[PDB]
Write a protein that binds this DNA or RNA. Sequence first.
RNA 1: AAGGUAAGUAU
RNA 2: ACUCUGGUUUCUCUUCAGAUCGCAUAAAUCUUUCGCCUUUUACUAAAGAUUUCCGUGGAGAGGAACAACUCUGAGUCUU
Lengths: 122, 572, 836
Amino acid sequence: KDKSKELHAIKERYLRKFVFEWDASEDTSIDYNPLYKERHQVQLLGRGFIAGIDLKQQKREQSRFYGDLMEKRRTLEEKEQEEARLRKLRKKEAKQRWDDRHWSQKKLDEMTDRDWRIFRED
Amino acid sequence: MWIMMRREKRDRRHFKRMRFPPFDDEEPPLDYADNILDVEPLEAIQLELDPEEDAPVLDWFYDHQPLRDSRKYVNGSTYQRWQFTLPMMSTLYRLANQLLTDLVDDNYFYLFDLKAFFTSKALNMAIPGGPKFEPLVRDINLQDEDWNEFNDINKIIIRQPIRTEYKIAFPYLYNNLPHHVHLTWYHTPNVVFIKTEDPDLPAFYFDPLINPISHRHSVKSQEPLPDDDEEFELPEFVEPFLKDTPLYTDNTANGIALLWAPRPFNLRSGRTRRALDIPLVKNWYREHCPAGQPVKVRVSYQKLLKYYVLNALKHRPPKAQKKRYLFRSFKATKFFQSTKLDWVEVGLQVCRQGYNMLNLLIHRKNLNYLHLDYNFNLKPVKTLTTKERKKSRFGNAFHLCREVLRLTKLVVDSHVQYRLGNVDAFQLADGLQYIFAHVGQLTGMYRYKYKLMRQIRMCKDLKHLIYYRFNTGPVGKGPGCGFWAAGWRVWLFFMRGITPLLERWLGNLLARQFEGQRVESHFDLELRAAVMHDILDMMPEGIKQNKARTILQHLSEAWRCWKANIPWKVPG
Amino acid sequence: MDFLADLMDNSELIRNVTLCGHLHHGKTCFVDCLIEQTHPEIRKRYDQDLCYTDILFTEQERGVGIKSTPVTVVLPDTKGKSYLFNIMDTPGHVNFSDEVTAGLRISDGVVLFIDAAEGVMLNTERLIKHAVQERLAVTVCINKIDRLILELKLPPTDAYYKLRHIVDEVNGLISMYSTDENLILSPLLGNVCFSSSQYSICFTLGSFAKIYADTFGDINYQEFAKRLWGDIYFNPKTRKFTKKAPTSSSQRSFVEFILEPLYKILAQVVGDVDTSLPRTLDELGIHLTKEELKLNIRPLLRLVCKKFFGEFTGFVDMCVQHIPSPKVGAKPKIEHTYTGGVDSDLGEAMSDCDPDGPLMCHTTKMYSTDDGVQFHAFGRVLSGTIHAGQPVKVLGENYTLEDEEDSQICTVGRLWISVARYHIEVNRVPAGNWVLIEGVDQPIVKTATITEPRGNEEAQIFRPLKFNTTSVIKIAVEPVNPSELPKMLDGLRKVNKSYPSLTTKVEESGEHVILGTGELYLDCVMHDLRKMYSEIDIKVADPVVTFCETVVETSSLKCFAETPNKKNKITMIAEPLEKGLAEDIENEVVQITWNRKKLGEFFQTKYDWDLLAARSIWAFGPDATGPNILVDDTLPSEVDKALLGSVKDSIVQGFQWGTREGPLCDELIRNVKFKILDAVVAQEPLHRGGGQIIPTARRVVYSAFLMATPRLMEPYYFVEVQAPADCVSAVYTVLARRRGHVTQDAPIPGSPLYTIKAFIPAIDSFGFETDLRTHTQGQAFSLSVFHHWQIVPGDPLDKSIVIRPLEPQPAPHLAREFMIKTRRRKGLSEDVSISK
RNA sequence: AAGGUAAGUAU
RNA sequence: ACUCUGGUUUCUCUUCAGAUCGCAUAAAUCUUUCGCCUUUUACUAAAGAUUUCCGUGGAGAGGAACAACUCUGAGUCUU
Ligand SMILES: O=P(O)(O)O[C@H]1[C@@H](OP(=O)(O)O)[C@@H](OP(=O)(O)O)[C@@H](OP(=O)(O)O)[C@@H](OP(=O)(O)O)[C@H]1OP(=O)(O)O
């Protein structure tokens, strides 16, 4: 199918009602070239992230190429510092998740005002 | 706010979206003397700033017009020309990492920048991720040229098809007639910036990302160096220039990372902007659409890019003016007074005043069979007869004013509901976002202005840009997103344009004095009038007025004699 | 102002340098810094760069240097000796390498700009090789030092390691091209300078030692600079420089005294403006006003580095010491450039660079005016002075002492000394300078020699400009309205005058083909043609590459051709050449003008040709250094050698013409050796005329080449890409898609970027740069240069192969297709007429 | 938003 | 190491605006090309020229906070 798409592109080159929605036919991001369809997203050295999208999900969608490169090039001494930083950040985020958890994981006596109003609003 | 709202949507699995309209149609607007004045507000959306890291900005981060009275950072009460220090700029830059893409150079915008889109519009094609436009010049006859010996396909070697991007990267080489075309920046050098991931590490560090230099000793590097430690000796007062100064402070890494920062965060000082003039999500659709996204959000991306390109292209420098200021000449006259009021109180006052004005306009001809409720819905008080239905007609301008006052009433009522305590601050933000994303559904003001649809389709588009950035992680779809800046500014930009129309329609309506195929039937009538006026002016008509009509008769017959192709020679 | 004019008389106080380097390495920004230093009223804006030499509208929009720009300015030295510098700001893009050569011929010195982060790149290697070929002095400037500090955040020891690796790699590159040992580089020798033109930093070891000696006093800045690089350490216990580290972690002299203060000043400026910057500026003696501390980080850093470092005296002293003046640097230039050699009387006079000698200019550039209707020649005066409004004799590339046809007398109008944006009108320009000559544009096409009329009649021309790479991209250009055909031709003429490597040729069918090096080069050429020269609508055909023709087998039968006089018979055979021999001819390793005894010894040694057979070599084709060799192998007892030598010249011209116009698709012929096996020449002198032999020689060449197995040759470009380590796989995928194979993928030492070097078909390289940058989302960038001709797969004479229009043919169908369409583009017949 | 007013006598 | 050097903020008025007035972006009218066409009032969407509107900079002027000392450079700046 896609092989005939290239030839069709070559041939084509040479030879009342209110619509709140935008029609899907208006889409321009349609390509036959595999290079222009599955583009290589910017890794940003494994330390940059696209705006808006949450960092936690972006970390698990990473290509892991730079993570493997770091764990390969790093010596033991500099590996320990990164391991300690990762452990500290993991513990901080674990504490944050423990404090910010659903009311199903808390007893009635230990409920806070925010969790109380969350339960009431349900 | 973006960080906080995703926290209050991820945890709040079921979100109570506000009910619109907040108040009943017949309920009069709430008085600001027994309902909101005495009640205390609920908590607002405010992130818990860390006392250790976010110390420079902790004191004033959530204050209205921060640091206005600090003469060191802001010029004064006029709130212009902020001067900031590097620690605060770096702290602010970290608190905005969610809204900023970590792009170091504009090589990302290779053929996806403004010049490339101008080229594509001029050349009638379109970048895949870019917008589509009506052709600059039709040239349909010249679009399909004949099978010349020059463009002969039998003489053309095809290896890789010439894409739209190729005809944009080198516009003057790949297509004929490259008119009104723009040349894009070829290649900014790859800014190889390596941002630190741990503060507990020297600012100047050989990061593992750098490929090791690996100074080779295979060839013994030989260079002319004099006989060691025998002839040259430094004086005792000679030391490296800055030996007391440390190599790096705590702010060295953050100061370096501030250099490779987006436009607002790479400045030490600057000028104060309006909240309207700050597009927070402008760079979200300026970049490429994230992969793995549905069709509608992609089309939203191309349409937002289309509107951005059209604005940037059809832009003319502002015209010189004498700077006459409104709200300055009001208080010059003895008709206006100045005070300070809570914004909710002013909103209620303006809603009531707009209701009074629309009520005055409705009972213009002493017709009392049209009733305007407090939600700004116009309905007959009874089954009105056909003559009365005709007699109670208002133009599109009146209904447009009614619908804009309805939108203001919706906004003020949402804020009033928040102030009373009915809805949360997060609920208020989500309600404002819904109001500004669904103005067509809420008010239906597009029926009286179809061009307004351009705003409406944009407000939905922005939603697709925001929602799919918002509901991305553990947070799923739901009525919890409250990033209402984009729709709010869009409707303000509509407002600045529509204000003159409503102002001139009103001022010429409720004033004491009212004011209200000609191309082809133009020159003949004007010519006859001019000739007759000249002849009658030179005529000594004190005795020969009765010839005047006769004169026109000649002006007919001669014309007829020309139209009949017959001789015309009056002897007398 | 007047001192600048009075400084031209002394040829010793003039330096003719050209700033060459890879694309976007800071040459233009460095010239901007020099201009700002010399011109008080010219300062860059805080956000936008200055780009003083980027005068074209294309340059200010593309952001890439297109044309070389002359900048004549007076620069103080370290001591204060105000020298006169003629800087040629050359484009860094490889496609415009020819634009460098135009500025490289009239320059006595080369300043190689190297990015600190990127290091040595493709165009850098090409430029050092080429400059060494023209026997020019080479000095290196590592620009963008701040990228090691503000971008990589390397430790000062690692920054020194990166700088040492950069300098040592150029030393290992010059050794591959220069036999002279004086071409070595070292910052302590004064050869290597360090700079960051974005922040106006410019220091050598001598300049920074001079700053130290000004700060503390009683220091020999020359002796101090002699110990400010390498493994030499500083011991403060003895206050002495020791080859062994005084302590365990003693930093080197360069790291401790040079890189450490620069790192600390940049760190204070970019991180501690409010806290420690005033203190460190009082420590450094720099006083900045309250408003000058209100500027953003980058303008403040540029200002503070302007105050601390002051003038660009390190660049000046490097150029003065290691780049010869025209007076002393004329002799190698005359030897390598003048056709008559240094032994000639005119050559001997020009070797002295006498301002009172006979006039001898050498125009290498041609700059258009505002309206584009008049061109100003630009060249170096080598002997005598040129006066405004003076009749002179303008030669041409085809002029010889025997043929005064190519020389036209023209009156020199106003003369300008050209400095980027503006030009200062002058009356006379003494020898050793650069001059914009007005009024001599008409006889000049590409390169000409200007001398005086009615005197110095024994004046040959300078050698024609020799370019680094061959131009193979070909585009056919027609007017949209045929009624406007002459204007396009007129415009064509103008671009031929404005681009040194441009080649405009009218074909048999009437198509006008333009030859260029790459996509950007031809894009700029068409922009110039459409917008300023022709000002008419233009139709451009799809880009195509030029092909060559070769053989892979010996001709099956002896091919004979007889003249229309029916008295002369030539029987010839065709054989392919050995590997590298054609390249040796192209590289001018061996010339036909060599002494014949050693000329045969070359082929007897490196290729083991028979001494008698090697001595039988007649000439090379189609040019003097063309890759085709014509060898005689007639039986001595069967053909009279003396009689055969009578028509030897005619056979040589026939061979050259036949090799220049191939039979397959009317293209060049490469890597073919034609052996003359039988000659039967009419004994009468008038029956062996050239008008009959030359067409017959071409016919027999065609027959022998056709009987030998023909093959088409397509150009292969050498592409190096610098991309993040993650993007290597994407580059591999793109290259594999475009019939290209990767030869190497090496990490750049001192930077995460990897450089991937590959070979791609030239006809498959159209859009390859766009494909790579778009697929990698701009992270990968490529520069393409022609590398070598390679046999395209498939039999080109296969008549059975059917070609489908609008389909990319498979590999075995390429060689055939590449012929037929090319023939259709030339107006030739449908197939190769072997019987013809 | 409209192009959807029956007109006529009588107070 | 010295004497004089006279502020900054803010409220108004009058003008000039090249410059991203604006690191943001509306509306109206007119003229052409279109898409709906069925009549204006609304429109489809590109272009050109205008007008209005939301804002802006510079300069000058007039009041107020300011209360002024002195910042600051000018210099003989002093051992
Ligand atoms: O799926 P759709 O029917 O297209 O609904 C989408 C979208 O929902 P999806 O996320 O499922 O695309 C939004 O809802 P969320 O699920 O993102 O919360 C949004 O809803 P709100 O703006 O009201 O939150 C709005 O739905 P609607 O406007 O119908 O309520 C929008 O509709 P469109 O994409 O069709 O404009």
